[PDB]
Amino acid sequence: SMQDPIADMLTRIRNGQAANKAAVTMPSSKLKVAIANVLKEEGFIEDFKVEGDTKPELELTLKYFQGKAVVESIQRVSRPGLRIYKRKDELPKVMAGLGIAVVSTSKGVMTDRAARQAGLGGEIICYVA
């Protein structure tokens, strides 16, 4: 959005899923693609690309196993006016461990397990189940 560009990413992804869409598109961003990269390895998204050397536009591909979709849970937490910063011993564990939790570390964007395995903390980004 014009105020919360990251929160929009999640919404556009979840809104697409519900509508059984194929691919979601929206303006890119260092953090955005960075986040989009994680869900990739996590198998939450098929692939992802962008267009524009001056006018970048993210391109994500939704995913679904059977009748229902894959990403059946995606919400934010560390939003503006109410940001969240956890330690290496406070990091959340989405769905008892199954779901992932994106968190920006001094090393870069990671997941609840990722950063933990490292032994460092960062500003939580969102919960993906």
Binding site: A19, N20, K21, A22, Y64, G67
Partner: peptide
């Protein structure tokens, strides 16, 4: 284009 996926899914 919003029907193609539904067409097979």
């Amino acid at each position: 284009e919003k029907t193609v996926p539904m067409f097979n899914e």
